[PDB]
């Protein structure tokens, strides 16, 4: 009664299995015999007294890989050919028949032998869909820069698809800020939704694939590496609120059009502000009359023509 | 101190090659070039030199035994399709890059390389054609030098570039073809980060296994049961059905059933372990 | 000799240590942890600039040459192509 077969004969219960060839893992401690019996068993300890140069680094790694590869062949050799195929599967070089179901009828009808049919296996990560945020640059030979939220056909792994990427910067490693276009001649952080992939997986982007719209221009639009995988992103955009001064008293001044109601001011009481000239200031309090007007103090006197800005995201 | 430098240039990133120790699959050779550059006539010329037989028409992958222990599969890339260019670059172990010498470089010749440059080097060989169109030897040799030094730009300096003058009876110069054929044999291939960790294969033949009765009682709109045949590459494919796999330009379909068939074009080196004969085509 | 007689050293890029640095084009942003292939000793090397740092990525081959005290080494070739050539967009790095 070899247990190699019995282990995978699910019809036989595990308790039935053990006895023939002779409870729960949630209990970490394994089962032990009764205490007094163990003591008598272990009055004598004799039963277990028995238990107690390569020239370069590079070839050592090569040696380790080869030595590991040699191990697989040795065991694969002795394994029965059926047992091998069960474990290793079909090895490369094997001529195999693959049967598929639920294929579109168009593939059968619109079949041209000239166009190749390539089949590529997928690891678990390729099945997952989520946000792929990556380092991307406009290709040097491409005429125009890419735009955010602009469709782009991307070549990832075995799969090609069209997606709407968003191009971002780290802003001195402080936040993920959205860009309108690619940098002219450098990489930028690019976020898009699609099938996930392992890091270190490179890709290309193309904006047009049809022959009709090919034109005379070079087509490979963008190049990059998947640097990140996640299923959210927190891309943010700078939103600047603009108000105007109408009454200025040395450092103190009153501003209008920044907000619509005093309630809006109240939420932003305590908020930092500055002018176009760069004079930093502060929202002190909301003026009762008229609505939306608030008092602000600046490090120096501002002028009527000065425009005050509140930086937000 | 040259020895230290020579001892240095041999050191590289320690990789693992998953190529089987026995019975490796035929290498995928991609014949890529602009339309009309001579892709079809090139394939016909090589296959004749390898197996001494001429194929009037070529469609889909063509597998031959090019060596005692080496086998090749020749694929013609549709020059007018960019999508076809991309996926072949993901699997083409070797590329035969066709360039029209009289015209010079063309965009797709650059773009195929560029797609290759981002998806991992296969071996790439430059083949220059239509050189007979040149009328003067001076302009010819100058064009060759300019063409060659550029091919050293995209591809490592000193990369081989083969030259073909004209086509006779639908065949290139036999002596030149023989030189290319030997070159295809001495090339030693490389481990690639994408190829060695996903299982892939190129379909040599396509078959629909749907019952004709089903096609009629439900209609042609019904989904179809399809069988695909060919040689596996890269990592071994697990035997159990249900594996998740992708077909380019079609979608992701789970294998319903799989089985290993005898090699239609077995290598002689395997057989003698168990010559004009030894060269086979399937 | 720093390289035991060689003029250049091949290395394995392990980590871009200064990647988190807030100040752009800082000296620390330009350092990368590289392990020498010939012996396995871990070493730090400079990158010419932050823009060039985009090209170097983990587990790629790098060629080192003599040059935050202590960093003696500058990357001169990555993945078989000169960094300056990539910086000048005269080339692409092969993968």
């Amino acid at each position: 009664w070899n247990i190699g077969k019995l282990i995978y004969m699910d019809n036989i219960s595990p308790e039935e299995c053990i006895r023939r060839w002779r409870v729960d893992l949630e209990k970490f401690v394994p089962y032990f015999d009764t205490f007094e019996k163990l003591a008598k068993k272990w009055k004598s300890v004799d039963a277990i007294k028995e238990r107690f140069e390569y020239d370069t680094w590079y070839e050592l790694q090569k040696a380790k890989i080869s030595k590991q590869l040699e191990i697989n062949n040795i065991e694969y050799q002795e394994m029965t050919p059926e047992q091998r195929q069960r474990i290793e599967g079909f090895k490369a070089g094997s001529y195999v028949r693959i049967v598929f179901e639920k294929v579109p009828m168009e593939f059968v009808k619109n079949f041209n032998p000239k166009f190749p049919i390539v089949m590529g296996g997928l690891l678990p990560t390729e099945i997952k869909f989520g946000i792929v945020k990556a380092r991307l640059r406009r290709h040097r030979w491409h005429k125009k820069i890419l735009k955010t939220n602009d469709p782009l056909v991307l070549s990832l792994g075995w799969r090609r698809f069209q997606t709407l990427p968003i191009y971002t910067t780290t802003d001195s490693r402080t936040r993920t800020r959205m860009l309108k276009y690619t940098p002219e001649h450098t990489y930028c952080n690019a976020a898009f939704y699609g099938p996930l992939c392992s890091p270190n997986t490179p890709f290309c982007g193309v904006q047009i694939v049809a022959n009709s719209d090919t034109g005379n221009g070079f087509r490979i639009a963008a190049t990059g590496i998947v640097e990140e995988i996640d299923v959210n992103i927190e891309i943010v955009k700078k939103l600047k609120l603009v108000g105007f001064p109408y009454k200025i008293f040395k450092n103190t001044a009153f501003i209008k059009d920044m907000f619509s109601s005093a309630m809006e001011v109240a939420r932003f009481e305590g908020a930092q502000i500055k002018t176009v000239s760069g004079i930093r200031g502060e929202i002190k309090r909301a003026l009762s009359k008229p609505e939306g007007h608030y008092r602000a103090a600046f490090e120096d006197k501002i002028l009527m023509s000065d425009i005050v800005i509140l930086r937000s995201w | 101190q040259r020895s230290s430098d020579v001892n240095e240039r041999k050191l590289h990133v320690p990789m693992v090659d998953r190529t089987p120790e026995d019975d490796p699959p035929p290498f995928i050779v991609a014949v890529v070039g602009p339309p009309g550059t001579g892709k079809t006539t090139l394939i016909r010329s090589l296959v004749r030199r390898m197996t001494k037989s001429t194929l009037n028409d070529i469609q889909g992958p063509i597998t031959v035994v090019s060596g005692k222990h080496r086998r090749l599969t020749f694929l013609e890339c549709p020059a007018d399709d960019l999508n076809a260019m991309i996926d072949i670059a993901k699997i083409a172990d070797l590329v035969l890059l066709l360039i029209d010498g009289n015209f010079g470089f063309e965009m797709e010749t650059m773009e195929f390389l560029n797609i290759a440059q981002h998806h991992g080097m296969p071996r790439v060989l430059g083949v220059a054609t239509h050189l007979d169109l040149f009328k003067s030897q001076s302009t010819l040799r100058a064009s060759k030098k300019r063409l060659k030094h550029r091919f050293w730009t995209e591809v490592y300096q000193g990369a081989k570039l083969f030259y073909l003058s004209g086509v006779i009876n639908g065949r290139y110069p036999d002596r030149e073809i023989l030189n290319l054929s030997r070159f295809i044999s001495v090339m030693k291939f490389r481990p690639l980060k994408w190829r060695n960790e996903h299982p892939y294969m190129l379909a040599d033949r396509f078959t629909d296994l749907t019952h004709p009765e089903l096609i009629e009682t439900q209609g042609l709109q019904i989904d179809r049961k399809v069988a695909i045949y060919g040689y596996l590459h890269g990592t071994p494919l697990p035997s159990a059905p249900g594996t998740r796999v992708h077909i380019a330009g079609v979608g992701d379909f789970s294998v319903a059933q799989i089985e290993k068939l005898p090699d239609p074009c077995p290598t002689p080196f395997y057989q003698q372990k168990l010559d004009d004969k030894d060269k086979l085509i399937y | 000799s720093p390289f035991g007689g060689s003029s250049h050293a091949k290395g394995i890029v392990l980590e871009k240590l200064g990647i988190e640095s807030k100040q752009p084009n800082s000296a620390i942003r330009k350092c990368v942890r590289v392990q020498l292939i010939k012996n396995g000793k871990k070493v730090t090397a400079f990158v010419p600039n932050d823009g060039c740092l985009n090209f170097v990525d983990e587990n790629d081959e790098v060629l080192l040459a003599g040059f935050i005290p202590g960093v003696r080494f500058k990357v001169v070739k990555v993945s078989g192509v000169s960094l300056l050539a990539l910086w000048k967009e005269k080339k692409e790095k092969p993968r």
């Binding site: 005379n216 | 015209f103 010079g104 063309e106 965009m107 650059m110 730009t153 | 000048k88």
Partner: peptide, 25 residues
């Protein structure tokens, strides 16, 4: 139908600083 490569492709000059004409001779 045939779309010859442009000058930027032809020389691969890339990004270079502007240089004075006098250097040419």
């Amino acid at each position: 139908g045939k779309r010859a490569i442009n000058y930027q492709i032809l020389k691969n000059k890339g990004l270079t600083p502007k240089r004075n004409k006098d250097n040419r001779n």
